[PDB]
């Protein structure tokens, strides 16, 4: 199956910068969310869960179709804790009804990452909403109680290699886990509304202890009150992953370039851009607009 990007009828880079700006301004407006974490981390996770449904073997799932708008997918157990980010975006869709759902969910994550002082992430429009019957069944998103072999194997389905995996997992500098969503509890670090390489430094520098939690799942805890999922921990248990973790912990510039590429790829897997499709767009932050 082939999904060909189709640019929203007469839209252009400034139309999409407007939508960016709208999401960015609402991030500021609602920055009290989750005792001032803000909605940024939730939007990044949202954009990853909408994209993470892709199966490269038959091109099912993926961001192009905007299928998260159907109750089968937004009620996926794996998507618990994303309902507020979804509701966040709803009025903005109402403000810009010409944009497709997948373009909107994808753009939410690009916007969040940039506004949280992360790398610029080029973005491309043209995802086209696809009907209810194309929604992917539940179960395509990764489990957290697993090891490096699982992770490596899992991400192969998303066409991601070891560097891309380690780079993408770096978004766990953002936000936190909550028992009520995922059965895990705590943040990975202190500055969890800022996009930095802190995840890698914490993995490497903190003393970690396997402990069982209130949901009877096991997770790795530090006395500073940080935590690592077993799949996060697997990144230093595996020699090849460990090497790249060290690389990003030592060079945030390198992490930013690698993350930007991997995240764009993640968001665009499944999509065929025609020969005369427009080039990727890089959005200015509010800051760069003096807004
Ligand atoms: C083996 C792959 C993955 C696993 C098992 C995993 C697991 C989880 C867990 C269970 C949490 C907590 C959710 C909660 O309780 O609300 C979560 C949070 C988060 N994850 Fe992942 N994740 C992985 C990959 C990714 C990737 C690739 C990214 C981004 C490129 C992503 C970004 C996020 C974000 C930003 C949050 C915080 C959301 C919040 O605070 O609102 N994760 N992850
Ligand atoms: Co949350």
Task: Outline the structure in words.
There is one protein chain. With 291 residues, this protein is mainly alpha-helical. It folds into two domains: 1-141 and 263-291, Peroxidase, domain 1 (Orthogonal Bundle); 142-262, Orthogonal Bundle (Peroxidase, domain 2), CATH 1.10.420. The chain has helices at 13-29, 33-36, 40-51, 71-74, 83-95, 101-115, 148-156, 162-169, 179-182, 198-205, 230-237, 239-250, 252-268, 286-289; strands at 3-4, 176-177, 186-187, 209-212, 218-221, 227-228, 271-272. The strands form three sheets. A three-stranded antiparallel β-sheet has the order 4-5-6. A two-stranded parallel ribbon has the order 1-7. The longest helix has 17 residues, at 13-29. Protoporphyrin IX containing FE binds at residues 41-42, 44-45, 48, 81, 142, 144, 151, 168-169, 171-172, 174-178, 181-182, 184, 229, 231, 263. Cobalt (II) ion binds at residues 34, 42, 81, 175, 178.
């Amino acid at each position: 199956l082939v999904h060909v990007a189709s640019v929203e009828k007469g839209r252009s880079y400034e139309d999409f910068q407007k939508v960016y700006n709208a999401i960015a301004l609402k991030l500021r407006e609602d920055d009290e969310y989750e005792n001032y974490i803000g909605y940024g981390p939730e939007l990044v996770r949202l954009a990853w869960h909408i994209s993470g449904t892709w199966d490269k073997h038959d091109n099912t799932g993926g961001s192009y179709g905007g299928t998260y708008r159907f109750k089968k997918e937004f009620n996926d157990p794996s998507n618990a804790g994303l309902q507020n980010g979804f509701k966040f975006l709803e009025p903005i869709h109402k403000e810009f009804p010409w944009i497709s759902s997948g373009d909107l969910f994808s753009l939410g994550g690009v916007t969040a990452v940039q506004e949280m002082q992360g790398p610029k992430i080029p973005w491309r429009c043209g995802r086209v909403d696809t009907p209810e019957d194309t929604t992917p069944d539940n179960g395509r998103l990764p489990d957290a109680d697993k090891d490096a072999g699982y992770v490596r194997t899992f991400f192969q389905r998303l066409n991601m290699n070891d560097r891309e995996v380690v780079a993408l997992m770096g978004a766990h500098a953002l936000g936190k886990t909550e028992l009520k969503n995922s059965g895990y509890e705590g943040p990975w670090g202190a500055a969890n509304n800022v996009f930095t390489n802190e995840f890698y430094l914490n993995l490497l520098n903190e003393d970690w202890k396997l402990e069982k939690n209130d949901a009877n799942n096991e997770q790795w805890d530090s006395k500073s009150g940080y935590m690592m999922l077993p799949t996060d921990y697997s990144l230093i248990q595996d020699p090849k992953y460990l090497s790249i973790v060290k690389e990003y912990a030592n060079d945030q510039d390198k992490f930013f370039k690698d993350f930007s590429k991997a995240f764009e790829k993640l968001l665009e897997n499944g999509i065929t851009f025609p020969k005369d499709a427009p080039s990727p767009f890089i959005f200015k932050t509010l800051e760069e607009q003096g807004l």
